[PDB]
Design a protein around this ligand. Sequence first.
Ligand SMILES: CC(=O)O[C@H]1C(=O)[C@@]2(C)[C@H]([C@H](OC(=O)c3ccccc3)[C@]3(O)C[C@H](OC(=O)[C@H](O)[C@@H](NC(=O)c4ccccc4)c4ccccc4)C(C)=C1C3(C)C)[C@]1(OC(C)=O)CO[C@@H]1C[C@@H]2O
Ligand SMILES: Nc1nc2c(ncn2[C@@H]2O[C@H](COP(=O)(O)OP(=O)(O)OP(=O)(O)O)[C@@H](O)[C@H]2O)c(=O)[nH]1
Ligand SMILES: Nc1ncnc2c1ncn2[C@@H]1O[C@H](COP(=O)(O)OP(=O)(O)NP(=O)(O)O)[C@@H](O)[C@H]1O
Ligand SMILES: Nc1nc2c(ncn2[C@@H]2O[C@H](COP(=O)(O)OP(=O)(O)O)[C@@H](O)[C@H]2O)c(=O)[nH]1
Ligand SMILES: [Mg+2]
Lengths: 441, 346, 429
Amino acid sequence: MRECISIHVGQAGVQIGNACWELYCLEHGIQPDGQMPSDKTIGGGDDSFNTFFSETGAGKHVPRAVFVDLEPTVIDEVRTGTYRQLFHPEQLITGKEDAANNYARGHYTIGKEIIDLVLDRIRKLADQCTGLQGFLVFHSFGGGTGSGFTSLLMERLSVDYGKKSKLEFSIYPAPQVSTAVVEPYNSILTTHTTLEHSDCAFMVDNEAIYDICRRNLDIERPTYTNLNRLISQIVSSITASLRFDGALNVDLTEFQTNLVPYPRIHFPLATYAPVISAEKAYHEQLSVAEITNACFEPANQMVKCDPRHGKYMACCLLYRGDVVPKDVNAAIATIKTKRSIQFVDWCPTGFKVGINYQPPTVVPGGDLAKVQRAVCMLSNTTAIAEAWARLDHKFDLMYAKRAFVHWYVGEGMEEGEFSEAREDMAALEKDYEEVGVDSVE
Amino acid sequence: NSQVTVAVRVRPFSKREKTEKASQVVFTNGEEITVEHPDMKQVYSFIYDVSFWSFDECHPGYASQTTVYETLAAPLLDRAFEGYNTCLFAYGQTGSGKSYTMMGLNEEPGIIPRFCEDLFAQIAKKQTSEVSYHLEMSFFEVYNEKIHDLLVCKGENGQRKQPLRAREHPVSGPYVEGLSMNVVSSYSDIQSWLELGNKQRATAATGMNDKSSRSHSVFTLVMTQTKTEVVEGEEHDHRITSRINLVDLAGSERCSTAHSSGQRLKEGVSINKSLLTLGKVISALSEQANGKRVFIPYRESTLTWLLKESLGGNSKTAMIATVSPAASNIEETLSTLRYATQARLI
Amino acid sequence: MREIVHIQAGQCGNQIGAKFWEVISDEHGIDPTGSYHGDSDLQLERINVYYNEATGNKYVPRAILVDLEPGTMDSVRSGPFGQIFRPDNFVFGQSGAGNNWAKGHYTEGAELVDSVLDVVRKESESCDCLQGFQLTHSLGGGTGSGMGTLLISKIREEYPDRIMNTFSVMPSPKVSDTVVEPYNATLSVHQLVENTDETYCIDNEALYDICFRTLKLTTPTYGDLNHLVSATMSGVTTCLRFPGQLNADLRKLAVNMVPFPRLHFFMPGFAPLTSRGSQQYRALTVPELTQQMFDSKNMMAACDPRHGRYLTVAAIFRGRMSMKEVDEQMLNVQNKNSSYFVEWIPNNVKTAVCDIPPRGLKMSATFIGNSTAIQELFKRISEQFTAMFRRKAFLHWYTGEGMDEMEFTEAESNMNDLVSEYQQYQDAT
Ligand SMILES: CC(=O)O[C@H]1C(=O)[C@@]2(C)[C@H]([C@H](OC(=O)c3ccccc3)[C@]3(O)C[C@H](OC(=O)[C@H](O)[C@@H](NC(=O)c4ccccc4)c4ccccc4)C(C)=C1C3(C)C)[C@]1(OC(C)=O)CO[C@@H]1C[C@@H]2O
Ligand SMILES: Nc1nc2c(ncn2[C@@H]2O[C@H](COP(=O)(O)OP(=O)(O)OP(=O)(O)O)[C@@H](O)[C@H]2O)c(=O)[nH]1
Ligand SMILES: Nc1ncnc2c1ncn2[C@@H]1O[C@H](COP(=O)(O)OP(=O)(O)NP(=O)(O)O)[C@@H](O)[C@H]1O
Ligand SMILES: Nc1nc2c(ncn2[C@@H]2O[C@H](COP(=O)(O)OP(=O)(O)O)[C@@H](O)[C@H]2O)c(=O)[nH]1
Ligand SMILES: [Mg+2]
């Protein structure tokens, strides 16, 4: 059946994972102990759908996910928290030492000694599946585990399973904000290895979500929880067509056919427009014409790039709730009338649509309002080429002086792995310039 | 004030691979060396100070051992008699042509023989009784940032690799404490000593080859020149010394692919760290050539620290990169070329 | 299970450690008998980093106390928290160093290092994993300077892939406390520039100034000065033994803060320090700590970063706080004060957050900085050194214990060759 395996890698992936599983349990009615009271309420009904959880005879619902870190700190809070009786206790920790912001320690040195145990549970998870779709990988660029461990895992999964969707949900690096001096290296080296092996890579930046939580929700002291709780809704919109019913279903194997023209240009963005507080939930109609326009304005992107400096190639639009299709056709007509939103000449259509009837669920203790309708937008632009240059320009400076390279060489790397990885990203800058060129014949 | 000279050499196809039908990957338009493979949309170019095309005998730019010497190593003996020091590095990977361009063969001799013979046979035309010449010779290795003498015989007991210490003399410069320095009269003595040394040099088996070098080997020649000039009395009133270092380096050894564990990995990391320091020092000498106040990181690796007085100041430094033209060896050749580029980025 | 082995050599190191354990035991709840009498459950989950189990739920630390004379050792045992030390770890001897590096490195320390390596080997093989070591000592005598450096040289050979921190107490510019600080400090920098990964330069004039015009104390004794160092030590190792939203071990900071392997001398700092009367006139917020942690009147280095430039900085926060505040403030520092930061490093700040703060506060912070201004400490010593070495003043007390003049020039040059490595990154072009 329609099945997906989630893999949470490093601190960001695991914390975002926590957020995601607190949201998956409430939509379906699973208590944190893994039980369902609906088993007593109505007999013979699927609410804890088999796409995200496996069932037992005792009426438990155990999630199809694997968390891995290299340090026991972040995953020791799942064993000592509310959701301790939900996950299979084989939550992979390689405690010993983490990657400490080094790609090499997460690839070979400390990255090994735990990957075989990771793929064994990934086999036990897939063998339980009656025909699976793909894998959801949640990690961050910049950290030593989120980059290295993921790049190693992605390459093995490319041999074992092969023709399966490998979708990534990654935290891309901000241009100004940062929490490390080695995010450029750990990004450029992850790209060189997770580009021939990924199928689609959804990007989010922390700076883009801070400005939303300030402007849209009136929060001037936001934390990582108020940040992960939007990332939960974005994954829920993607994963709703497998769980809940709707008119136009959109499975996971459709994205990579919709949003990836070429096999190297598969770096789309994300945005979730109706980010509203309870006070501004009123004074608002919250119609499709407002939301869809809100998904195309730069002040509501979850990545800090101005799409008016580029051209859209493709755009998926996944609606949730009370939504009639005509209200989508008219909205897309309006968006196509405008001259700011500019498309390539080789894609007049440039719109995939999906609709699902189940509206979102409001988490208790949240900053999001209850909504009759919600929308996501997974777009592919050339404006990303103006971010990959920045991360490259930083790479151009430090590597000129060979700073923070002793630490990589010291854990099984070469000087030539940087030049080979930096030359692969200078080609991905030329491709995004080719796709934007006017065609002729 | 100091001039670095990078030269890059391409070997011809092996007999083992001229029949196996390997696909040529490196080309040249005379000046620049280009790397191309049909699979790739991209082709990388590399311009060096000197390219020694040794692929096809019928080329108008063929480079035999008589050319790699006359173009690179011969201007280093012309400078040693002026009283200044010289360094000559040999970089490559296993199968590139390093030991063939450096030492050579029974009847096709590399740089060491054509240099020593052109030394001893060039002082015997200026060896008066007024001017004299004395030659001494040392030969050591760096293994995991630890100096070892190779011309010392082992015994009948456990580990016989005795580590020595590198000290800093205030006037002259750094030196190894306890190193056997031997006196030489001909080329045959150097040949015997080197043949005695390269059997003690560290070697391990890896996927690349049966015998891969795991140490930076350093061969030194100290030349003294005593002149007698009249100062109204007895005349011994002159001696200027010159140092000639010829060094065979190890390879990078991508530890990602070769799934290394233990001492090899350890060794690998050591060699990778020394090559990173050496590269930086070589690229800091080139900035001075143009002109800029800059600081050389000599005391970051032992090899660049022992050769401080042969790398900077009024000193000449040469570097021979070797690369294979086969398509099986394309990540190694590219790393070699990228490493040679940063040396000379003038 | 990351584990730290804590050596403490000499009077300075031993007193600082005796105050540090008084501080960490308060953080985990251990009493002077070794018994846990806490309230929370997060105090015991990661207590292995500094303690080992015993029979009756008693916790014995990994202290390796070292001294060449028994006077300082006797004081620790005859003290408040002295019954929490394994007596087989008080490794000491007679025949002290005499404020002489030679006696502690060649004559009277070589005959005792083989007994300290026994306790190191016994406290390290009884540990599942090991993030590294950390030493507290002084570069002004012979025991902390000599018998400490040798231990580092002999631990790197055994454990090279592990961390060697060193909370060193460097000499002060204006007023000395020993007359042979220059020699004993240069000959330790010669052995702390090749063998260590994090060195934290502390100076006592800065701590006097903190006690005076930041804390308003008119009788600052040494316990009050070590109360400051114990706070920094606690802060570097908070994200190993407590949880957080952004965690930072030792190697994580060493990989951010050390661009080139030799420049690992940092200038520490702690916030907030509020002086018991301005406690009710201050806000407990992130900017009020960020303004105190970047001010030159709070660092412990006696070196003004305004005469230099930051190459990297770190900020270990402790408390329930917002990450946007940290990111925004650490961006504002670089934007407003770009001249005090390097251009070829885009972001010079590393951030870390822990959720469980120090028992009496709602928020705390800890600061590490790599500045070129550190050269002012060394450039002075080499000015003293060559003034005393030109005349060979106090040298026969060093040559009479088995040393040569060549071992001095060696140490004189490296330090200078370090200043040029810092002055390389001082001016903008
Ligand atoms: C009302 C109140 O908040 O009391 C505070 C207090 O008023 C001030 C003055 C305290 C006080 O600090 C000092 O008096 C002091 C004097 C010299 C050197 C160092 C400290 C305090 O004594 C110190 C004490 O700090 C702690 O208790 C921490 O746990 C501290 N450890 C210890 O003090 C300690 C020492 C020995 C044995 C057991 C515990 C700590 C700090 C950093 C990292 C780990 C632990 C605290 C909150 C206070 C008093 C008591 C007044 C401050 O100290 C610290 C490090 O927090 C100085 O500024 C802070 C906060 C306050 O301003
Ligand atoms: N949105 C979000 N971002 C996070 C979170 N935790 C960390 N990050 C970001 O991820 C990057 C750092 O990556 P980590 O996840 O800490 O790294 P790691 O994969 O654990 O790797 P090492 O700790 O280096 O071994 C920075 O950009 C952080 O801001 C989180 O909970 N939410
Ligand atoms: N210009 C050339 N002309 C002819 N043969 C060449 C040339 N350059 C290299 N060769 C061949 O290259 C071979 C070198 O192989 P080999 O002796 O294994 O070197 P190597 O030991 O593997 N390199 P290294 O281990 O780093 O010293 C010789 O046998 C030569 O026949
Ligand atoms: N901060 C602090 N410094 C100290 C203490 N005791 C000594 N010192 C410093 O240590 C230096 C003298 O070193 P010393 O401890 O005597 O070396 P040792 O005799 O070999 O152990 C002087 O610069 C003192 O300022 C102390 O309790 N606290
Ligand atoms: Mg982590």
